[PDB]
């Protein structure tokens, strides 16, 4: 186990909407849970976009998950992560 580094970014603001992306990088092994939460409740699969769990080239893995939200409601959305028994929650940066 290598603990994942988590970074949350905002991008592609348009039409009152914005994309929030949660990136988990340089973790091992490949098995990881990554999902957006809304008021603490996990979003379904169909409302999120999923990156593959891919090797770094440094012997670890990385992935990402993104979802499209209304600009202004960022505080209600958090990125949730479970990796080999440990869990964490990260907010959208403000």
């Amino acid at each position, epitope marked *: 186990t290598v603990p994942p580094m988590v970074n949350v970014t905002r991008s592609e603001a348009s039409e009152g909407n914005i994309t929030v992306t949660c990136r988990a990088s340089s973790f091992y092994p490949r098995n990881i849970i990554l999902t957006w939460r809304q008021d603490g*409740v996990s*979003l379904s699969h169909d*409302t999120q976009q999923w990156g593959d769990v891919l090797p770094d080239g440094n012997g670890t893995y990385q992935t990402w998950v993104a979802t499209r939200i209304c600009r202004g409601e960022e505080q209600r959305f958090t990125c949730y992560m479970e990796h080999s028994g440990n869990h964490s*929650t990260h907010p959208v940066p403000s």
Partner: antibody
Amino acid sequence: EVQLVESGGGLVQPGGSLRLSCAASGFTFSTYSMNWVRQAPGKGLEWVSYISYRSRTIYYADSVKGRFTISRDNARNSLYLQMNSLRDEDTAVYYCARWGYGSGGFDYWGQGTLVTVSS
Amino acid sequence: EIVLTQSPGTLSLSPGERATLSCRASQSVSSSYLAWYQQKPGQAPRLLIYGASSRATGIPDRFSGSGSGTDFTLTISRLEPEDFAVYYCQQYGSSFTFGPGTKVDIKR
């Protein structure tokens, strides 16, 4: 003051169907996720179904998936539960419950409505 | 599925004493996703504690919560006769489930 008022329960035949409703007031309804929670007679609480404030995320307990449908009409401050193929184990008081902003929890509950499934 | 168990099943205590209620999760639940509810006999439940330790609106200070991982605690210091109720813990780490509840009776 936040108020949620359920209605529509009653006696129904096994295999029958029944529609529950919940009328909300005192807050901007279209901005809160909503839930149904039930309590069988003398029994514990059992979460039933969840719907997000724009109906994009919906969940059901395994014991009702395929038989119950949750929905909402934000313009009428209303939450619905359509119940089909009812069974005896569906007999309960059904509570309407609001989901708390940011930090979650069932932060307000309706008064409950009783559904009895029997022939 | 995450299953919540609660101990003790029933708790009989005199007014002014301290009630200690336990909740156990079949797997790790983050503290943000653990809540506690109070339900008096003829009533709907009401939210007591959210995020394991935060008091909900209008909840007096004698109600307190703590815990993390798989073990959580609700403390009611200085019991009152009206505190007679069933207390349920609830998680939404994964889906939404309730513990079976602990009945708290008043001794007299």
